[PDB]
Amino acid sequence: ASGSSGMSIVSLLGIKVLNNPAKFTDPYEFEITFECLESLKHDLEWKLTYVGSSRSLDHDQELDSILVGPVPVGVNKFVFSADPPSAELIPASELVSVTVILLSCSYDGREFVRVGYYVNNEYDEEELRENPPAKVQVDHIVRNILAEKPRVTRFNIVWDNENEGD
């Protein structure tokens, strides 16, 4: 606060959710468009996170992370590909039709943006949608990212120069 190095170099302009509504075991594909005002020393870091009610382990599941090279000054486009979650960590008696994914970008380790998305999951069969199992048949689950209602959150991180010590 006593150092609102506000001036934000990168600003998210849009996230196309192509690939949706693929299968629960299908990777996540995002077409993120953003602009970079000045040049940056370091790389931008992207990450997807699975958030979902559970009675033990299902939330805070980081799905994946990646560091993007040199960010060209101007309006850029980057396609994010995130691995699906291991069934090893989703309710066994699951029927968690609604969960959340948080896509966020950071810089030099300081997070500066986060996009919240609600997801819809349901088995792909009539009776199994009328008389479910007691064991989550993962590969019969079809997620549906509600790509239309995204919640955005900008933070105020310090970027490059600040004159580390003075």
From Swiss-Prot:
Changing residue 118 to E: Reduces acetylation of histone H3 on 'K-56' and enhances sensitivity to bleomycin, camptothecin, HU and MMS. It comes from the Eukaryota. Changing residue 153 to A: Reduces acetylation of histone H3 on 'K-56' and enhances sensitivity to bleomycin, camptothecin, HU and MMS. Residues 7-161 are annotated as: Interaction with histone H3, histone H4, RAD53 and the RF-C complex. Keywords: Chaperone, Chromatin regulator, Coiled coil, Nucleus, Transcription, Transcription regulation. Its main location: nucleus. Transmembrane segments: none annotated. One of its GO terms (biological process) is subtelomeric heterochromatin formation. One of its GO terms (molecular function) is acetyltransferase activator activity. GO terms for cellular component: chromatin; chromosome, telomeric region; cytosol; H3 histone acetyltransferase complex; nucleus. Signal peptide: none annotated. Belongs to the ASF1 family. Interacts with histone H3/H4 heterodimers via both histone H3 and histone H4. Binds with higher affinity to H3/H4 heterodimers where histone H3 has been pre-acetylated on 'Lys-14'. Interacts with RAD53 and this may impair interaction with histones and chromatin assembly; the interaction is reduced upon activation of DNA damage or replication checkpoints which in turn promotes histone binding and chromatin assembly. Interacts with the CAC2 subunit of chromatin assembly factor 1 (CAF-1). Interacts with the HIR1, HIR2, HIR3 and HPC2 subunits of the HIR complex. Histone chaperone that facilitates histone deposition and histone exchange and removal during nucleosome assembly and disassembly. Facilitates histone deposition through both replication-dependent and replication-independent chromatin assembly pathways. Cooperates with chromatin assembly factor 1 (CAF-1) to promote replication-dependent chromatin assembly and with the HIR complex to promote replication-independent chromatin assembly, which may occur during transcription and DNA repair. This is Histone chaperone ASF1. It comes from Saccharomyces cerevisiae (strain ATCC 204508 / S288c) (Baker's yeast). The chain holds residues 1 to 160 of 279 of the full protein.
